[model samples]
Target: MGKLFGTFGVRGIANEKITPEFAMKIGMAFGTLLKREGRKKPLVVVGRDTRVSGEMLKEALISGLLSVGCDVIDVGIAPTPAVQWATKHFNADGGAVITASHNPPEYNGIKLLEPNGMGLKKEREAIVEELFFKEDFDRAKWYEIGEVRREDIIKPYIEAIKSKVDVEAIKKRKPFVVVDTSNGAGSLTLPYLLRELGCKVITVNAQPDGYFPARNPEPNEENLKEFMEIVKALGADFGVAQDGDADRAVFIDENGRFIQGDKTFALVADAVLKEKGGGLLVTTVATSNLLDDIAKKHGAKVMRTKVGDLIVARALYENNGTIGGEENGGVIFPEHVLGRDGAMTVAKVVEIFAKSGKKFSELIDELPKYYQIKTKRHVEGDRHAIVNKVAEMARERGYTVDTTDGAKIIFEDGWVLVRASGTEPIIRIFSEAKSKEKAQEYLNLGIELLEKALS
Candidate 1:
């Protein structure tokens, strides 16, 4: 009833906000909605990451679905993207993934997906939320209770990715690579995919441990220090790291430099455009302008959306985009799947290297450069009020402001975006420019404006 879904899915600290009861209600609501649409004996697929509470939440979710007479297929312990692929491959009515993505061990969540493997759009999620709060469930009769079946989706998922790229070329190159799964669900698939491509793979924190004992599940530069070190020391051609659900990835170049997620997004976009000759590329407003630069070179164009994967995915579907993604390393290859896929990105990167015979660092250097600074501040009371105030102030200053997702003020030499967090009690400030000094200037200006609005 009270706003269950966040930016992507319903996430909370396990057993506290995301209890079994809550998960059951979500399942019942989702199943009931499917039945209302006249889907008789609808089949729904479910999958989960390696969080300790995954099984507990999954059992509750399945029980609710079965109660509604919705047949369920359980694909145990896989990445979010793998579950999404299975959902489409099985031709199910819908699917759900139990994962908190980059959240810590104490947290877990559920991401509902459409039959096309995309996350439920906002309107669809709204319907499910309403059904949940109203408790309008279609309970099955005693004799009509649904049954559950198990399947292995990993092999099919890997094979599907291999088919999308020039696997034989990658195998011939036999590049050396390092993979850091961060002890999450990607441990089940990424390394195997790399080996299948003929890469001499070096794995770090590759075990699928729910506790994430090796490091934080989020594969950012700070958490990936050791990962980068290993890649460099081993003289590997490159390195890749996946978040908790393996829907996102960060890269380390042959020089062992930790590339920003935005750069990786652009690199893939460039590769995709090169392969397709030209196509529409979809991404969020918060992504770097370097994407547009790459698009110009390849006769492609970019479509901007709000700060969510669902938004980008929908735009990609409607526009017939060749590729789409977020700056946070969530690359969406529409040719493979609509959702962001870390494994797919990994394979594509390898294919690019094999086909171009260019070093990862050299390829990256060819792209346009921009400096970005991101900062966030916790706020209390009426977060929207502060955002409105900032938007008004920016407009008054004659800056070109876009409120597509939040407030993005564009300038000739730089840009600044201020948006309130949907899942937390804070506001985020992101700025970009050609130099660190100019980027910091915008950030300082944004902070000053925020401070004034709070005052």
Candidate 2:
């Protein structure tokens, strides 16, 4: 009867919508659900990112877990994926993280995890919403209330990441890398990971500060200009940056080129698919066609899911996929963990660069290049109707259209997509082509079709 969870989890502006009371209710809701599965006392692993409201809401959430007799392994102030690993490492039944991931400083969220370390699916979220709405949480007897203890999941999680990469190869090269943690949770582990990988490391915004005084947590080009220059000035082999919770990582090439997230995904895909000789890779519909091209070259296949890491991870799991991720730097290695893992991505990036023995920019240049333009149009009425109209128009014009997540009109050398916002009155248009001019042309075509639909 209630829809509380968004695409990821229950997120809101801190202290306003996602107050302690809301946090506590979510805690109780999950704890009650775990107990109902017949465990007398369920074990839950909990962690949070370094946000101002993190500690405040974590305490409230923990109290709610206690009320339902769910013992909590509080892995304090670690990256979100580390907590996901802890849930599997400690053999806990469930896990929870208090983080907003890459959101602005003022926002925070409650992200729940399954036993396998994946984020809560929409179906699982529905159960929580029902329990939360009904207030039908399991209340522990006074003597049976749960207990809390703290542990460090970061160290072993680091080791787990190291085990997956070519450590010896990375050690021999001793690549120089500049890492910017954006003053978030990645600060605690990335430096140590690089030091152990035998890299010359210069870190920026490495200090763990909730206020994020240095820069915003997103590692986009605009937010990373200084970081990019540092990479070039220092002659770094490459650079990597993590968002607030460190579940994703974006990269910089040796030339200090802001390696687009789509290109990075393609690079990683090339590496992983080559290792497997041929295997299935999963990605979102919004992902670049370079992935499809790479997979075809390797005699592999790519399964395109809707937009979201969890959806890709689930597809990977269900299909025994080799790797899966989004156009963003959120690659998921199902063998390591069933979620977007920043540390793993960093380690794998180091391995790929070391094994290739090619300069970072050279590696990027090796791939088929495409340029992208993304824009949105605000709508006053039904956005989906407009989106559908664009799809119908594309089909009428004899275009191969994909409606997996939106209306994607495919061309010989490019593609354009029209997707309606789920919760807003807006339509997003995206286009990509080998040349910038063609990309713009297709984007203009998209705009024309959308306007025609509106008319």
Candidate 3:
């Protein structure tokens, strides 16, 4: 009842924040939602990361789904996107993945995907949320009840991704690479993909262990120091790191430079524009401005949406964008699956590297550079009051303010974004300027304004 749906999904501190009881109710609600959507035989695909609690939660979820007469396809120990792709491939009613993504171990959540393999829209999510809190159990008769099926989807998924890129060309290059799966569910398939690409792959922490002892599962530069050292020592072409569920990827180039998620988006978007030609590109407003400029330079229109893969992925599907992603390390490839896909993103970048005969670092060098600073501050008192104060300040200053996600104030030279965190009780501050010092200054000024407003 305590707001089950977080920014990404129904995440919490495992048994305490998320328990089998809550998960069962969510499954029941999802089943009811599918039935109400006019599907007679509802089959929901379920997958999870390498969490010890996954099986327990999965069984509870399965029981709830089955009780509601919805057949379930159980794709075990797979990445989040694999489940999304399988749901689309097998024509399930929808899908639910049991993963908290980059959140720490001992914490888990459930992500719901629509029949089209995309996360639910806000309105649709509201339905599930409503049912999650209020729906009575609708156990079906034995004859009308659902069934569960175990499916082998990783091979087909790998083959599909392999076909998307020029495998033969990648094999010819035989680039040396380091991949850190962070002991997540992606461990099951990433190594296979690298082998097919013919890369001299050195895999680290690729085991599907629920206890992530390697580092934090976020795949950021700070969380990937060991992998960076491996790339530097082995003289690898690049390094790839996936989050706990492998739905997001962060990269380290040959020079051991960590490429932010926005940079990866730009690299893939550049390839998409050249090959797929001009089309709409969707990214979150929180994304770096360089992506928009790159898209515009390539004669493609860029659309901005609110933060969250659900929003961005839906925009990609609704707009038929060439590509879509978030600046925080999520890459949504509509052609592959209408969700954040670290695997597909890696394939796309590898394809770009092979086709252009350019190193990963060189590809990044081609992108326009802008210094960015991001800071999050805990909010006090009424959240709405703080938001209103920031908006009023921006209005008085004659700055353009966009409230789509939060309060995004556009200045003459840079921008300051103050938005309440979806997953935490805080306000996220973002600023970008021509120089690092200027970016930090803008960020500090935004914080100052926010503090004054709170006071």
Candidate 4:
């Protein structure tokens, strides 16, 4: 929300944008925000993804926090979700994770969290930014510097996810799953969790190599094409994939079909609502409309947020939401943790397959059918102006528009969300329709409108 902080936290290329000085300043700024209000020094939890820079950046960050007199509990090399869960588990003053989520190997970022295990709101991010820029800190006096202690939360974090699912049911099924952990922090947990749940776990990219020799961490269809083939060839029950910090859980069905994030979101919503007799579900405008139908079939209501898991998580926390996440393989079970959790999504999805006696493909096919086209275009000038022009163009054509985060033009048979990327130099066009042809048509229409605006 400032020069340094973006939607959730500060993100950029490691070393160049997130060097030791940069991370150290952020640590001091964050420690300043959480300086001990009680008799004891403020305590902050720290963790990082498996990117090569995380180790260096994390040390710098911890050094800064300690200098500012904030006690630190280090949960080294864990998923962002695990770190967030540990915040509440430890009941610390706040939390911080050095993860770029699905970013590429060269990029890394920092996400600061509140004690409730939710990411800081934009307003709070601004507060930290102010401190970072002001060069002001709560520097500890001589012999008063805070201390750091090492702990292993990945073990307990895995255990917590196991307790939430039907372990016996999964074991009875003994589902053979091919999991692509993406060679990131998830390498530390996902395979072990599957083994504990009695799953025949065949892992791909399961090593914690920062070089990312296997593939980049983002588990899109293109990145996991071979992963899907392996699942089908090996006759595995299904395949699960994770992003860099393992906050996302994209899947491939038994037939090796790459399932969309929204499909999993809807299927899980249906399952959770049925189990809980219905409650509140939250998602982003970028998410699918299938959730509306799922909530209606059950006795639940849906709440729409902006296009970020942090926003959805905060809404869920405030409104007592039961289940929610993004349409990007990021499902958040707030009952377990108020963030997108790769391990939990993997476990719950397995439970759904085990208990229903349905293949993962079947469960996905049962969801309301809608085709989506997600594309992006680079522009030479102001991105927001182009998006606004698209909104006006849609309104002139009598289509309703929702400016929740960007310009979301609503259509009867489909919808399109046109917005500038928060971290890229392009405008993203996300459209969904009842048919693939229609989805493509909508995509073309969006691009045409954007081109028209440029002209």
Please tell me which predicted candidate would have the highest TM-score against the true structure: 2
Q: Each candidate's TM vs. the true structure?
A: 0.92, 0.96, 0.92, 0.91
Residue 146's lDDT in candidate 3: 94
For model 3, the superposed segments whose C-alpha errors exceed 4 Å read: 385-389, 392-395, 411-413, 422-425, 444-455
Between candidates 3 and 4, the one scoring higher on TM-score is 3
For model 4, residues 1-455, the per-residue Cα lDDT tens digits are 35888777778998788888999999999888776334358889999999889989999999999999889999999988899999989998889999887777888889998886788777767778889999888899968899999999978999899999999999999999999888888999999999999899999989998888887788889988899899999999899999888888888999999988878878888889999998999998888888888998999989989875488888998899999877774788988888888788888888889898888888988888888988888875688888998988889998799888788888888888898887678999999999998888888888888888989
Better of 3 and 4 by lDDT: 4
Candidate RMSDs in order: 2.3, 1.7, 2.3, 2.5
What lDDT does the true structure give each of the candidates?
Answer: 0.89, 0.89, 0.84, 0.87
Of 1 and 2, the candidate ahead on TM-score is 2
Choose 2 or 3, whichever is better by lDDT: 2
Q: Candidate 4 — worst ten consecutive residues by lDDT sum?
A: 33-42
Query: Model 2: what TM-score?
Result: 0.96
Screening candidate 3 with a backbone cut-off below 3 angstroms (N, C-alpha, C), the clashing residue pairs are none
Q: Per TM-score, what order, best first?
A: 2, 1, 3, 4
By lDDT, highest first, what's the ranking? 1, 2, 4, 3
The clash numbers for all candidates, in the given order, read 0, 0, 0, 0
- Candidate 1: tens digits of C-alpha lDDT, residues 210-326: 999987699888998888888999999999999989988889998889987778788888888987899898898898888888888899988889885488888998888888888
